[PDB]
Design a protein around this motif. Structure first.
Motif, PDB file in Angstrom:
ATOM      1  N   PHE A   1      -5.293  -2.669   2.900  1.00 10.04           N
ATOM      2  CA  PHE A   1      -5.312  -1.436   2.135  1.00 10.04           C
ATOM      3  C   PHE A   1      -3.898  -0.908   1.974  1.00 10.04           C
ATOM      4  O   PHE A   1      -3.103  -0.931   2.915  1.00 10.04           O
ATOM      5  CB  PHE A   1      -6.178  -0.387   2.825  1.00 10.04           C
ATOM      6  CG  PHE A   1      -7.633  -0.708   2.810  1.00 10.04           C
ATOM      7  CD1 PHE A   1      -8.196  -1.472   3.808  1.00 10.04           C
ATOM      8  CD2 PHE A   1      -8.441  -0.245   1.797  1.00 10.04           C
ATOM      9  CE1 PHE A   1      -9.532  -1.766   3.788  1.00 10.04           C
ATOM     10  CE2 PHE A   1      -9.778  -0.537   1.778  1.00 10.04           C
ATOM     11  CZ  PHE A   1     -10.322  -1.297   2.771  1.00 10.04           C
ATOM     12  N   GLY A   2      -3.594  -0.411   0.783  1.00 13.00           N
ATOM     13  CA  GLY A   2      -2.243   0.017   0.488  1.00 13.00           C
ATOM     14  C   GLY A   2      -1.250  -1.120   0.423  1.00 13.00           C
ATOM     15  O   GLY A   2      -0.103  -0.964   0.856  1.00 13.00           O
ATOM     16  N   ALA A   3      -1.662  -2.263  -0.114  1.00 11.33           N
ATOM     17  CA  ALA A   3      -0.774  -3.402  -0.284  1.00 11.33           C
ATOM     18  C   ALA A   3       0.145  -3.260  -1.483  1.00 11.33           C
ATOM     19  O   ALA A   3       1.071  -4.061  -1.631  1.00 11.33           O
ATOM     20  CB  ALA A   3      -1.591  -4.684  -0.420  1.00 11.33           C
ATOM     21  N   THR A   4      -0.095  -2.281  -2.346  1.00 11.44           N
ATOM     22  CA  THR A   4       0.725  -2.068  -3.536  1.00 11.44           C
ATOM     23  C   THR A   4       1.866  -1.097  -3.257  1.00 11.44           C
ATOM     24  O   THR A   4       2.173  -0.209  -4.048  1.00 11.44           O
ATOM     25  CB  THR A   4      -0.156  -1.576  -4.675  1.00 11.44           C
ATOM     26  OG1 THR A   4      -0.959  -0.487  -4.213  1.00 11.44           O
ATOM     27  CG2 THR A   4      -1.074  -2.680  -5.134  1.00 11.44           C
ATOM     28  N   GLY A   5       2.523  -1.294  -2.121  1.00 12.65           N
ATOM     29  CA  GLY A   5       3.604  -0.438  -1.686  1.00 12.65           C
ATOM     30  C   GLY A   5       4.656  -1.240  -0.954  1.00 12.65           C
ATOM     31  O   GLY A   5       4.686  -2.467  -1.054  1.00 12.65           O
ATOM     32  N   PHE A   6       5.502  -0.561  -0.193  1.00  8.84           N
ATOM     33  CA  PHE A   6       6.666  -1.171   0.435  1.00  8.84           C
ATOM     34  C   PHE A   6       6.247  -2.063   1.605  1.00  8.84           C
ATOM     35  O   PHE A   6       6.341  -3.307   1.554  1.00  8.84           O
ATOM     36  CB  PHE A   6       7.591  -0.021   0.858  1.00  8.84           C
ATOM     37  CG  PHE A   6       8.882  -0.438   1.474  1.00  8.84           C
ATOM     38  CD1 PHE A   6       9.580  -1.527   1.008  1.00  8.84           C
ATOM     39  CD2 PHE A   6       9.422   0.304   2.504  1.00  8.84           C
ATOM     40  CE1 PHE A   6      10.773  -1.887   1.584  1.00  8.84           C
ATOM     41  CE2 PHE A   6      10.608  -0.050   3.077  1.00  8.84           C
ATOM     42  CZ  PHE A   6      11.286  -1.147   2.618  1.00  8.84           C
ATOM     43  N   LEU A   7       5.707  -1.425   2.641  1.00  9.91           N
ATOM     44  CA  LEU A   7       5.196  -2.173   3.776  1.00  9.91           C
ATOM     45  C   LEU A   7       4.081  -3.110   3.346  1.00  9.91           C
ATOM     46  O   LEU A   7       3.938  -4.203   3.901  1.00  9.91           O
ATOM     47  CB  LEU A   7       4.713  -1.201   4.849  1.00  9.91           C
ATOM     48  CG  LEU A   7       4.226  -1.747   6.185  1.00  9.91           C
ATOM     49  CD1 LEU A   7       5.180  -2.786   6.723  1.00  9.91           C
ATOM     50  CD2 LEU A   7       4.091  -0.601   7.160  1.00  9.91           C
TER      51      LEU A   7
END
Ligand SMILES: COC1=C(OC)C(=O)C(C/C=C(\C)CC/C=C(\C)CC/C=C(\C)CC/C=C(\C)CC/C=C(\C)CC/C=C(\C)CC/C=C(\C)CC/C=C(/C)CC/C=C(\C)CCC=C(C)C)=C(C)C1=O
Ligand SMILES: CCCCCCCCCCCCCCCCCC(=O)OC[C@H](COP(=O)([O-])OCC[N+](C)(C)C)OC(=O)CCCCCCCCCCCCCCCCC
Ligand SMILES: CCCCCCCCCCCCCCCCC[C@@H](O)O[C@H](CO[C@H](O)CCCCCCCCCCCCCCC)COP(=O)(O)OCC[N+](C)(C)C
Ligand SMILES: CCCCCCCC/C=C\CCCCCCCC(=O)OC[C@H](COP(=O)(O)OCCN)OC(=O)CCCCCCC/C=C\CCCCCCCC
Ligand SMILES: CCCCCCCC/C=C\CCCCCCCC(=O)O[C@H](COC(=O)CCCCCCC/C=C/CCCCCCCC)COP(=O)(O)OCCN
Ligand SMILES: NC(=O)C1=CN([C@@H]2O[C@H](COP(=O)(O)OP(=O)(O)OC[C@H]3O[C@@H](n4cnc5c(N)ncnc54)[C@H](OP(=O)(O)O)[C@@H]3O)[C@@H](O)[C@H]2O)C=CC1
Ligand SMILES: *P(=O)(O)OCC(C)(C)[C@H](O)C(=O)NCCC(=O)NCCSC(=O)CCCCCCCCCCCCC
Ligand code: SF4
Ligand code: SF4
Ligand code: SF4
Lengths: 77, 114, 156, 341, 208, 176
Positions: free
Chosen positions: D24-30
């Protein structure tokens, strides 16, 4: 010649593989300091970096002592 | 027997050529780090040059040593002319490969490789 | 809602322009680039649809990877792709760009440009006919039509 | 283990690592870094996304054929959460935002969504949950961001008792906020610092170290229900850190003191942006806040990672901010900042 | 008639045999063998250090004006002591003929560069070096021509794997193309095709 | 025989010199090229109105692949692997076993359309006309994985395109 010796010792002490306490103006690179061909090549290149004159390979292989280095520099001025 | 000498008739001449090539590679690392805009240190580059020179330290044939210095000179001229890209210079470092285990127990846990 | 309607109309306007003005970079690698020339040719005039070849990557919206990508060329392809400003799209044309192609099991070839760049459309064939490439271009246009950037932003 | 989850290969692109991870939240920096490491080792990665699919394109090359799967999800939709976590044995939680939008608050992104992910994952039979929190996650913190982090950490621990809660300090990398936030202040004349940055101590952590630790926590069998602290090797005062940032970027550093209330007013001015704000009041509070010291919690050394100093990777991030006069300057041309250790 | 059998040209066979004897007599020091294949191709096998004399003779002699170098390549035969076999294909426009000259060498023995005789030898010998590892002594610019920069190994050798050892991909962490060990989603399926029954008795080797 | 492409010398009479001087000062050949381009402007364009108009094709055209059936509905493929053997690109993967009724039939029949070079050797080597390269050429996808066909996909292609495939094979089977 004292200035030449001081500059040579300054360059040698900056080298990471030279122990400052074990270093002396008559310490043999291969025997006393336990270096190899490439370390000696790097040391001669560092000497070239200081005094700003080209030392050929044939002459560089005969510079295995700091005293030999200062003698070579003095002869070539 | 009486084999054709490529460049050197004896191991001492081959050692001389190796030293010349090492001087050339050593004096080019600052220029390479500057031109290619690498993020490595000059000390890291020189350490890599020494390491690449030192993995052939077991060779005792003057012809193989002559061929090694020929190939080293070619890949030095590829770097100087900026024919290589930052990609290749950094390929010398394997920054993306995972650390391969070297002990028997780790290899046994990982898989079937000897 | 009023804002929902406005952002829907706005992104319809923005998507229409992008789909109706496509500027591929002049970038051909191998035999697949001849079928691209025939798509440019009078029979299947691509300029009719609003599709114009530009030489500079800075002035290009689509990269048509047409031909075999080699290990010696992959850095250059990635470099020009990066130098393309966004929004930018990729159409991989023919077997050699889609996967390996005839040169899959080779020491010198990258098995698909999608290892190097994000690919939006895959056109199969060796080489795909000019009509097949044109169908892929129109499918890319229909994919652009479904983008809802402002609609995502409003609900974001 | 299922016969399809047995590792095979050499840990390359075309291998099988036996990891099925929903990130989840793979479309970001980390997120992009974690997905890169997973796909690189050859895992199955599921990427729930709510954005435009164009913004997920950089994740396509990260894995072999069929190894990256994209599914659409809603943060406030347990049905979509179950749809995406249904077939995975690892669930990684990197969802978070540094500002409050109209539809999502700090409570929503840091308490409600993490709790839903942890609760649905437990029902679905997910074996491992990794949850990213912040190092300064304090319930009594001045920052609503960090208060929500603390509450959500407690809720995640309650819902999924076998979780791994990771607490990074301040991640710096190419796409980060930290170094870019400090290096983009050159546009507003000088650099406004609270107490001139002499009362703030920070130890940032590197993004690759954070992602490698996240990956090693998945593979570690004795990190199941634990809490880690991901910090860098060196602690810096804020003034020294920002001065070093400007030295590396070769920008003229003109720091001036700014009182806390005035800085809060400035941060309130910048947070009226409909788009991504440049700075916010909670961002100012977090910047002024010193990083906590938690010697009891394990760390990167305990996960087998040697933390990378900032002096080795700062030129990756800050060379973009140089001018043409200074672009080609080398890494060792700037003396390292003074540390507080 | 025999519609499906290639007709032969005994006149050309005789002419090629005569010229092979001519060359073998003129250059006894280097020519080791001369053959004429039955589809009328003359082939001259020489000692490896007669490359420059033999090629210069075949180029400048009045009765052999082989002014054009059609090709230059090598063949890898691992079972031989001198595995590499350098092949020169020459074309005579004056006499409308073609000749072949064959030389042998191994990994560590150089072959004299023939760029002083033919200018096409430059890129031809660069390709031979790049793909086989054969070093050419006095070459103006000997470096890789076809392989990637920094490519290790010579791919056309028989002992080189078909897919090589490394492969490239783009890594987002380092923001550059990287080289990693090769790893195939579907491994190349090797087929054993050779029939266990002899096809051509005319080439049967002695049992030895 | 041979001919010279540029070996003529101009005539040096005063009329010819004046004509060349007029061509130099008054751009006669340039205006001639202008006239040629204008003629093309008033000609009719050769552009077809795709996708409402399609270019000509032939029964021999090689497009998307398909697996055929007998009129009874039975599959033609007998898992003989001749197509797998002959495939230049190694794009066919086949695995077979006896069926529940003892038939020699495939359990796996894959074609990697990103590896296929569309050469048509598989339908030359097929002894039962099972694998064919149909007339479809507009099958571009959005993901790479959609181009890795399997037995179900190829049988679906055969069922969808069977009429046209049968017509093309009927038209072209006397040349084979
Ligand atoms: C790499 O190998 C390869 C090759 O080898 C190189 C090849 O050859 C080929 C084959 C390809 C070829 C052979 C191609 C070669 C072809 C040619 C060289 C010729 C083809 C033609 C061109 C290249 C021409 C290209 C021209 C282009 C792209 C121009 C398009 C750009 C624009 C239109 C943008 C500029 C215009 C603008 C910005 C308009 C702005 C206008 C305004 C702002 C006006 C509005 C002003 C206002 C104030 C608005 C308000 C107005 C109001 C309110 C009025 C309204 C009022 C009313 C009442 C209505 C292939 C495939 C290949 O692979
Ligand atoms: C400089 C020009 C002056 C004359 C202007 C005349 C009219 C111009 C008409 C054309 C407008 C062109 C813009 C079109 C796009 C519309 C959106 C837009 O403009 O977005 C801008 C930016 C957009 O930010 P952005 O950079 O994220 O935008 C990218 C574009 N988007 C996201 C839309 C795709 O909006 C804002 O900045 C508004 C939010 C609040 C910001 C508060 C800033 C305070 C003032 C700045 C200085 C503060 C420090 C001062 C220090 C010293 C104090 C003493
Ligand atoms: C140069 C100066 C410009 C300055 C800016 C002013 C802009 C002026 C507005 C221009 C509007 C252009 C309208 C375009 C009309 C679309 C034509 C039509 O075909 O579009 C259809 C519908 O397209 C979209 O659904 C809508 C696009 C146009 C509507 C945009 C929103 C309304 C425009 C007004 C601005 C928005 C303000 C709304 C309130 C905030 C889809 O057709 P398409 O599939 O492609 O055709 C394929 C070809 N075939 C048919 C042969 C196969
Ligand atoms: C004085 C004149 C003021 C100058 C007006 C603004 C100039 C333009 C500023 C600008 O364009 O850059 C702002 C810059 C752009 O960020 P990006 O790199 O685009 O990140 C997005 C990545 N996708 O925004 C920032 O990140 C800076 C945030 C730090 C702001 C800190 C606030 C404190 C400054 C106010 C001090 C004044 C007090 C009096
Ligand atoms: C009563 C006494 C009156 C005295 C006046 C007498 C003057 C009248 C007779 C002399 C007139 C001569 C015409 C002057 C223009 C001549 C220009 C010229 O020099 O001709 C060409 C140069 O001109 C060109 O080559 C043109 C190249 C570019 C052509 C591309 C566009 C031209 C096609 C469009 C036609 C233009 C129509 C003009 C319309 C104008 C509408 C306002 C010669 O150059 P070269 O052939 O290369 O050789 C010189 C060295 N050996
Ligand atoms: N980087 C840092 O400085 C530190 C970060 N952390 C934490 O680590 C995590 C990752 O950090 P980082 O990469 O910097 O953050 P980013 O802002 O770069 O990425 C956030 C991700 O979460 C998604 N997201 C945000 N809000 C929502 C929502 N309401 N519903 C669904 N998805 C949403 C975004 O998707 P989309 O773009 O589609 O909206 C994006 O994929 C966060 O939890 C952060 O708090 C902890 C310590 C330090
Ligand atoms: P002393 O002379 O006793 O010792 C010399 C050494 C240590 C070399 C050996 O003991 C030695 O003489 N060994 C004999 C065999 C031999 O000759 N070895 C060396 C062969 S030369 C060779 O290997 C050249 C290789 C080229 C190196 C490639 C450089 C690539 C570096 C990339 C740098 C990029 C960073 C920016
Ligand atoms: S897919 Fe076929 S036609 Fe296209 S570049 Fe490759 S070999 Fe050429
Ligand atoms: S058309 Fe050729 S390359 Fe394609 S599957 Fe058939 S035999 Fe193989
Ligand atoms: S050649 Fe025809 S019958 Fe034989 S395995 Fe292939 S498709 Fe089946």
């Amino acid at each position: 010649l004292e200035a030449i010796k001081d500059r040579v010792l300054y360059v040698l002490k900056l080298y990471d593989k030279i122990d400052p306490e074990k270093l002396s103006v008559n310490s043999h690179f291969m025997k006393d300091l336990g270096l190899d061909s490439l370390d000696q090549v790097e040391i001669i290149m560092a000497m070239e970096d200081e005094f700003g004159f080209e030392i050929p390979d044939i002459d560089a292989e005969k510079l295995m002592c700091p005293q030999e280095i200062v003698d070579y520099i003095a002869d070539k001025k | 027997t009486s084999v054709k000498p490529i460049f050197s008739r004896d191991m001492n001449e081959a050692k001389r050529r190796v030293r010349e090539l090492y001087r050339a590679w050593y004096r080019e690392v600052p220029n390479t780090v500057h031109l290619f805009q690498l993020d490595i240190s000059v000390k890291q580059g020189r350490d890599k040059v020494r390491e690449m020179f030192m993995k052939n330290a077991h060779v005792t044939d003057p012809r193989v040593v002559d061929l090694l210095v020929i190939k080293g000179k070619m890949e030095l001229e590829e770097t100087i002319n900026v024919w290589k890209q930052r990609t290749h210079i950094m390929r010398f470092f394997h920054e993306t490969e995972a650390p391969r285990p070297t002990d028997f127990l780790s290899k046994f846990y990982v898989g079937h490789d000897p | 809602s009023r804002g929902e309607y406005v952002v829907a109309k706005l992104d319809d306007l923005v998507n229409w322009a992008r789909r109706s003005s496509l500027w591929p970079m002049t970038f051909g690698l191998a035999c697949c680039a001849v079928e691209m020339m025939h798509m440019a040719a009078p029979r299947y005039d691509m300029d009719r649809f609003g599709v114009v070849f530009r030489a500079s990557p800075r002035q290009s919206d689509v990269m048509i990877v047409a031909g075999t990508l080699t290990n010696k060329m992959a850095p250059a392809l990635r470099k020009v792709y990066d130098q393309m400003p966004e929004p930018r799209y990729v159409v991989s044309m023919g077997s050699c760009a889609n996967g390996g192609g005839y040169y899959h099991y080779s020491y010198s070839v990258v098995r698909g440009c999608d290892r190097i760049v994000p690919v939006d459309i895959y056109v199969p064939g060796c080489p795909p006919t000019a009509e097949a490439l044109l169908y892929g271009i129109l499918q890319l246009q229909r994919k652009i039509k479904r983008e809802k950037r402002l609609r995502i932003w409003y609900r974001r | 283990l299922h016969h399809a989850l047995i590792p095979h290969g050499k840990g390359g692109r075309s291998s099988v690592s036996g990891i099925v991870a929903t990130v989840f939240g793979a479309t970001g920096f980390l997120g992009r870094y974690v997905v890169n490491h997973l796909g690189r080792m050859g895992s199955q990665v599921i990427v729930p996304y709510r954005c435009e699919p164009y913004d997920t394109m950089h994740l396509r090359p990260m894995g072999d054929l069929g190894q990256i799967i994209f599914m659409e999800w809603n943060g406030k939709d347990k049905d979509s959460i179950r749809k995406v976590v249904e077939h995975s044995n690892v669930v990684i939680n990197l969802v978070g935002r540094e500002w409050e939008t109209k539809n999502f608050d700090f409570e929503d992104v840091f308490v409600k969504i993490p709790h839903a992910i942890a609760q649905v994952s437990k029902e679905a039979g997910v074996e491992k949950l990794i949850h990213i929190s912040h190092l300064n996650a304090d319930i009594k913190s001045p920052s609503r961001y960090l208060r929500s982090k603390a509450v959500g950490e407690k809720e995640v621990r309650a819902a999924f008792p076998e979780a791994t809660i990771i607490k990074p300090s301040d991640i710096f990398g190419r796409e980060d906020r930290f170094l870019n936030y400090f290096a983009s202040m050159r546009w507003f004349g000088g650099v406004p610092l609270i107490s001139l940055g002499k009362e703030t101590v920070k130890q940032p952590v590197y993004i690759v170290d954070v992602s490698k630790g996240i990956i090693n926590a998945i593979k570690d069998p004795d990190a199941k229900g634990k809490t880690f602290a991901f910090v860098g090797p060196n602690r810096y005062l804020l003034f020294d850190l920002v001065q070093y940032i400007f030295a590396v970027a070769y920008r003229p550093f003109l720091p001036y003191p700014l009182p806390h209330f005035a800085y809060r007013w400035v941060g309130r001015l910048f947070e009226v942006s409909p788009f991504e704000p440049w700075t916010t009041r909670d961002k100012v509070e977090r910047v002024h806040m010193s990083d906590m010291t938690l010697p009891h919690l394990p760390g990167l050394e305990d996960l087998g990672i040697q933390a990378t100093p900032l002096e080795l990777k700062a030129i990756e991030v800050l060379r973009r901010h140089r001018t043409y006069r200074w672009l080609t300057s080398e890494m060792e041309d700037v003396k390292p900042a003074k540390t507080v250790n | 008639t025999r519609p499906t059998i290639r007709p032969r040209n005994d006149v050309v066979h005789k002419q090629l045999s005569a010229f092979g004897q001519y060359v073998a007599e003129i250059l006894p020091k280097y020519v080791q063998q001369v053959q004429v294949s039955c589809f009328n191709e003359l082939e001259i096998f020489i000692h490896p250090d007669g490359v420059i004399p033999v090629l210069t003779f075949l180029r400048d002699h009045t009765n052999a004006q082989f002014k054009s170098l059609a090709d230059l390549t090598a063949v890898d035969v691992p079972t031989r002591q001198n595995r590499f076999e350098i092949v020169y294909n020459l074309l005579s426009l004056r006499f409308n003929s073609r000749i072949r000259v064959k030389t042998y060498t191994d990994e560590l023995t150089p072959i004299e560069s023939s760029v002083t005789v033919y200018k096409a030898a430059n890129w031809y010998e660069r390709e031979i070096w790049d793909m086989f590892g054969v070093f050419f002594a006095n070459h103006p610019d000997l470096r890789r021509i076809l392989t990637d920069y920094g490519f290790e190994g010579h791919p056309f050798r028989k002992d080189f794997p078909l897919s090589g050892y490394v492969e490239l991909r783009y890594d987002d962490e380092v923001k550059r193309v990287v080289a990693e060990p090769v790893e195939l989603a579907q491994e190349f399926r090797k087929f054993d095709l050779n029939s266990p029954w002899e096809a051509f008795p005319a080439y049967r080797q002695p049992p030895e | 025989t041979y001919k010279f492409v540029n070996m003529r010398e101009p005539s040096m009479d005063m009329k010819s010199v004046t004509d060349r001087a007029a061509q130099t000062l008054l751009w006669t050949e340039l205006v001639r090229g202008l006239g040629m381009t204008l003629s093309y402007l008033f000609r009719e364009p050769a552009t077809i109105n795709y996708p409402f108009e399609k270019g000509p094709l032939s029964p021999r055209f090689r497009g998307e692949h398909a697996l055929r059936r007998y009129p009874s509905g039975e599959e033609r493929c007998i898992a003989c692997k001749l197509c797998e053997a002959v495939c230049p690109a190694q794009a066919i993967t086949i695995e077979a076993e006896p069926r529940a009724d003892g038939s020699r039939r495939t359990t796996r029949y894959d074609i990697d359309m990103t590896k296929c070079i569309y050469c048509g050797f598989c339908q030359e080597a097929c002894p039962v006309d099972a694998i064919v390269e149909g007339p479809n050429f507009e099958f571009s996808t959005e993901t790479h994985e959609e181009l890795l066909y399997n037995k179900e996909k190829l049988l679906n292609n055969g069922d969808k395109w069977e009429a046209e495939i049968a017509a093309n094979i009927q038209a072209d089977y006397l040349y084979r």
